[PDB]
Design a protein around this ligand. Structure first.
Ligand SMILES: Nc1ncnc2c1ncn2[C@@H]1O[C@H](COP(=O)(O)NCC(=O)O)[C@@H](O)[C@H]1O
Length: 124
């Protein structure tokens, strides 16, 4: 989605309503957020918190990134999230996902001025 920050909002933010989600949530959202255009993106996480709350994680607990960079941050509080995982029977362009709701700490990578999330690293 143009800027890395905009791409993070498109791929990972859903405070647009849902405090949680339904059984077809990932099927709809993986498609509507354009994560099934080129291929079936195999896994993706949506965060059901305010943009302000998720942007705030960039000033919280500094942790190592999976790629070995040092610009990752873990939320002090648990956040409402939805994990989407491509099913065994899923075949492009009919991408199929399991919708898993959870409350976990998020880990995001941050970059830029202003310093904002550009990558979803993990939930713990
Ligand atoms: N530590 C990191 N800082 C900035 N980007 C990072 C990073 N660790 C991994 N990435 C990026 O992870 C990307 C692939 O996943 P993604 O960034 O699309 N995933 C969430 C997002 O950023 O919206 C690659 O382009 C990497 O450059």
């Amino acid at each position: 989605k143009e800027t890395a920050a905009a791409k993070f909002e498109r791929q990972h933010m859903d405070s647009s309503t849902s405090a949680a989600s339904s059984s077809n949530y990932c099927n709809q959202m993986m498609k509507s957020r354009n994560l099934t255009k080129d291929r079936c993106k195999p896994v993706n996480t949506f965060v059901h918190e305010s943009l302000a709350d998720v942007q705030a994680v960039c000033s919280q607990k500094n942790v190592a990134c999976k790629n070995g960079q040092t610009n990752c941050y873990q939320s002090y509080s648990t956040m409402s999230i939805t994990d989407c995982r491509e099913t065994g029977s899923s075949k492009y362009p009919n991408c199929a996902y399991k919708t898993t709701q959870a409350n976990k700490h998020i880990i995001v990578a941050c970059e830029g001025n202003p310093y904002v999330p550009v990558h979803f690293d993990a939930s713990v």
